[PDB]
RNA sequence: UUUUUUUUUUUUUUUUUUUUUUUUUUUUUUUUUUUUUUUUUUUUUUUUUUUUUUUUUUUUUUUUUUUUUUUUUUUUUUUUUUUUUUUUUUUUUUUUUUUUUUUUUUUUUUUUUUUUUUUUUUUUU
């Protein structure tokens, strides 16, 4: 009965494990990104540099949003690099989660607030809370050589929760789409049938 | 009428029973894990060692989440070991519940907070409360050679209750799925029909 | 007015003001309402499949005089 | 507030302060004493004295950056009157109540949503209900 | 004007239960609207998945048969009164300590008032 044995603290301390976040690309996915990104023209350190470019784009755009964003970085076009991320079966956000802190750190030092701040109607009090990959600010596996401002602050964290509501809302707006059929079964439910009915003028 | 007889305290004290938690794998299930895990390449003490690896993964991942997590441990790949647990008809959490304290103890001594802390939007005040197998911290049958910090603390316990709300929420998000049919009876209710309707802009 | 990339040589009044921002949110409700009024149109067919749903069928029914 | 100073329009200069991510008060806190000193020598009491209903006894206590009068880092070549006086300090505390009140009036606004979630709480819903004529 | 060249069989029931249970012969029409108003208003290009539970516990616990209607208002008064354009964030805590300490089983009701008198007196400056 090996499970009945006492592991002993001396052995527990000898394990020295590492945090294993799932909001970061898998090692093989990181390689998949290399297979695409390096193939795209990036090399060595440019791997991270270009991905940081995308993370900065994700800061102002988002998942496929940053994917659509063009512009040649120090290594290659954002879209090309985004394709590499897609080749790894990851969203740009997945990579951005890992590079969330350095990304925020860059903009924090350059005072470049999120461009979607306005779109999300985020209060000016929470100007720096409109960050899709804000979870990387807390993620122990997230990269970070130095963060100019403690955005992780609990006040900002609750603001990030409010920000999460935004993320949830949009999810309801798009993720909430009812995939009630695959082979075009419009006879069950027509396209755009899930669209909410127009609001009535009455209270009830 | 044997039930009318007095058992006598002298005999009650002679019983010396052991706590029987149901959040731990059954003896035969522990064996089932051996049948898989030992077969997977683990041996003797590695049985617990590898499972501890998974418990550490569960700390940052969860049930099938840690199951999907790869990486070769001192005995075998996490996924392979996870399969052994599945062979025993248990979730990784089931094993983790038993190895919750030593697992937490490892990270507590290494200062490795849960990677899903960010995802769950858990307040920094409760940074170490984001532990799926926190119940093992109180479970009398849970293994533990030495716990660096009394995470069981009542304040943390109420925080764990708040954490339970997270567990409940996600359960509502996934466990709340309406299994209203088996043989694809979409004519009764279409796939993804349970998806909540989009929120209205009005208060009522 | 909040967009960091938006052009601006000089703004006479700080319309970005948080009070105005919440008012802008209320304004967003207007934008949402009209979106519901037009964007909410159900594009349930392309090649004139009126047999599935007739034109202007999405039009809300007339309000009843009763509370229920 | 507009008006071209010896260097540039107040608003333009204010924009510079905003570019630095600071409120004018932030700069004023540093230049609170010299500022007060100017008006103290020119006998120019705060124009918002009336608005704040500050007692005439505390006419010179209606100063938003009064903290700069005590701040050791605040600039000051010479202060005509010791506004820091403890009596004035307690009056400044009373003045702080004004600052707190207005904060409650504006800072107290409930930012319960970002993306216009009026369905949770409608705009201006935080507005206090009208007072009843009864004592209870 | 566009499709074929797209996929199943080899998956499971019968032998499970009712009739013979109840209404008609109960009430409306002959009551009122049209001739009332919009389009020409705005969005897409916004973001998630890869997040977690089961294996947790009850039944076998108790009421009905207890009481009201037949009690009173409308016909009483406001609008036409005033604010915005006023100010904060960027300020600080956690990691501090208790449980395991003691009562119930101690005593009143059934004791007395209303029906007694002022306003219409003076300051601010």
Automatic annotation (TrEMBL), chains A, B:
Transmembrane segments: none
Keyword hit for Ribonucleoprotein: yes
Residue stretches making up the Potexviruses and carlaviruses coat protein domain: 24-144
Compartment annotation: Virion
UniProt keyword terms in alphabetical order: Capsid protein, Helical capsid protein, Ribonucleoprotein, Virion
Protein's UniProt name: Coat protein
GO MF annotation: an example: structural molecule activity
GO cellular component: helical viral capsid; ribonucleoprotein complex
Keyword Ribonucleoprotein: yes
Function: Required for genome encapsidation. Forms ribonucleoprotein complexes along with TGB1 helicase and viral RNA.
């Amino acid at each position: 009965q090996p499970w009945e044995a006492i592991f002993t603290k001396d052995d527990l301390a000898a394990i020295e494990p590492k945090p294993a976040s799932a909001n970061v690309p898998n090692t093989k996915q990181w390689i998949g990104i290399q297979a695409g990104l390096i193939k795209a023209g990036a090399t060595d350190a440019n791997f991270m540099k270009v991905l940081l470019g995308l993370s900065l784009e994700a800061f102002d755009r988002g998942s496929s949003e940053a994917t659509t964003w063009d512009g040649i970085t120090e290594g290659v076009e954002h879209r090309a690099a985004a394709n590499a991320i897609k080749e790894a079966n990851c969203p740009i956000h997945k990579v951005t989660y890992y590079l969330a802190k350095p990304t925020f750190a860059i903009r924090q030092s350059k005072n470049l607030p999120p461009a979607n701040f306005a779109k999300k109607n985020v209060p000016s009090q929470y100007k720096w809370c409109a960050f899709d990959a804000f979870d990387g600010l807390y993620d122990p596996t997230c990269l970070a050589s130095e963060l100019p401002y403690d955005a992780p602050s609990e006040i900002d964290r609750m603001a990030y929760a409010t920000f999460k509501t935004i993320q949830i809302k949009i999810a309801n707006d798009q993720k909430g789409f009812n995939l009630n059929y695959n082979p075009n079964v419009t006879q069950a439910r027509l396209p755009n049938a899930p669209l909410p009915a127009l609001p009535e003028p009455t209270s009830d």
